[PDB]
Design a protein around this ligand. Sequence first.
Ligand SMILES: Cc1ncc(COP(=O)(O)O)c(CNC2CONC2=O)c1O
Ligand SMILES: Cc1ncc(COP(=O)(O)O)c(CNC2CONC2=O)c1O
Lengths: 277, 277
Amino acid sequence: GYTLWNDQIVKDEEVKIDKEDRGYQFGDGVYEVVKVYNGEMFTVNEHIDRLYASAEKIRITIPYTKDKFHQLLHELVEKNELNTGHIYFQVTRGTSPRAHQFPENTVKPVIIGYTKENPRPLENLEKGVKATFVEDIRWLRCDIKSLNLLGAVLAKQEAHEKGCYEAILHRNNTVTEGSSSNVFGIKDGILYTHPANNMILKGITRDVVIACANEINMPVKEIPFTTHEALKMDELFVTSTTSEITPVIEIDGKLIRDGKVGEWTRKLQKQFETKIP
Amino acid sequence: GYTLWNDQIVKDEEVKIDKEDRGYQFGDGVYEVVKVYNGEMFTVNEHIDRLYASAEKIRITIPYTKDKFHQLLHELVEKNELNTGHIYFQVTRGTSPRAHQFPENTVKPVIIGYTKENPRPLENLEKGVKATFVEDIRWLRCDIKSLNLLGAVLAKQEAHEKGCYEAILHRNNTVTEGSSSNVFGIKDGILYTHPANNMILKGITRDVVIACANEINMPVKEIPFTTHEALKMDELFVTSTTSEITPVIEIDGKLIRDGKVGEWTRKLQKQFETKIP
Ligand SMILES: Cc1ncc(COP(=O)(O)O)c(CNC2CONC2=O)c1O
Ligand SMILES: Cc1ncc(COP(=O)(O)O)c(CNC2CONC2=O)c1O
């Protein structure tokens, strides 16, 4: 297929990364993932906004305007004939002789973007999945969507080895987010989720779900809960650009309530469905 | 020059890195830096043992034996005609379609290694440097020498913008290590340094400096110290494969004692000198 390399659309084969690209040596870069539903990009402006926000937090100046980057993404979708799946794009500080400090503001950032066909995980949305609690050992700037994802890969692998779909991370027993998602809990018609601070990534899906809750008049409390309190919830689910609204019906062999998708989780999924292209 | 690429020493122009190499997308890899003095590698075996340990901690299997990696670095040094500088080598989990969890055991790791001419830091070793305190916000597995270095690059940059050489990190007021070095303090002829746990990298230079202390009858206590205690030290200095033993004479405008390189630092530098090829 075709890949986005800076401001050019090229065949995958023509793309080569330099050994001294800062994203290869320091994980010095940021990224985003956007879901495409039948040719249309879902919440593309919000993801672009967050990419530029993440870049700014680590002081990376993206050389193109948001309008140009938007046009670039559209061209990438049209050329790859992407129907349903997602676009992955990242920006690193650039190539420069190895040194921890920033280069000389000449080094142009390196932008890489590509597509992948991937249907909605319908079966997981319907039946729910199994999860597991894993100690959160990541750094203290989880609000930045950077390429430093080693903590998340190790947590995801521990989950996959136990036959679970996602690892629910916790710091001192206080639930934060999943290795690649945000976590929500419902008790007596009230929606609970960790507030948006340096401890979690302010997910775009997470925000759309909170909007959906306000729309159906379901109260929301952005208050942290513990692993033990999570097990005492009536319903539990995780959110991500790829997972959408995935129900968690079991954690470490302990069923959530009856082990069935709850009443409110279905009302949110239904309200979410109205926003999809 | 020539670059070590997997098991072959090739021309740099022939090396091609894939966009889906896990080192580029997740910082999923480990690395090392070996110093070379007039064509001879310093503490090679120590650095090689650590590379294998680091990889082992994140479940990466290096396909060659330690003997083959050593002859390869030797070859790399011969081919590049390296006199005094360093070798940089890294190992990533490999190339595989983007997914957080480990790929199938069929994918082989990617190994990259190269050299750089860089003289010994004469001025710094003789006159000492200025450092600055920066809060440690890195992950909790600092004992692994991985490519997830964004926390370190932001700290080092903060230090450079202030006119400082190194950033001395502290986690909840307890001094851990520097953005790219280990930190030592001296009070009453006693050597103090943070113990080797998940909070710091067990540096090779660090261990050598501890071997040097025992050789000159100097008592060593691996007990952590706070920022307030660091400023009350008689002597302060940082260690690393490239900085060797660099004296820190000031931190944020506060002189360490009289602002001159102390007596025990010099003795330690003198003893270290006897180990250099
Ligand atoms: C740690 C973490 N928290 C939350 C989310 C959910 O954010 P969004 O709702 O905006 O998607 C993600 C998405 N991470 C992704 C999405 O695909 N691959 C990733 O690395 C994540 O990695
Ligand atoms: C965080 C950190 N602690 C300690 C050390 C000192 O370890 P050694 O004594 O074994 O070198 C380093 C060296 N890091 C280096 C050395 O050069 N490039 C780097 O990233 C380091 O990055």
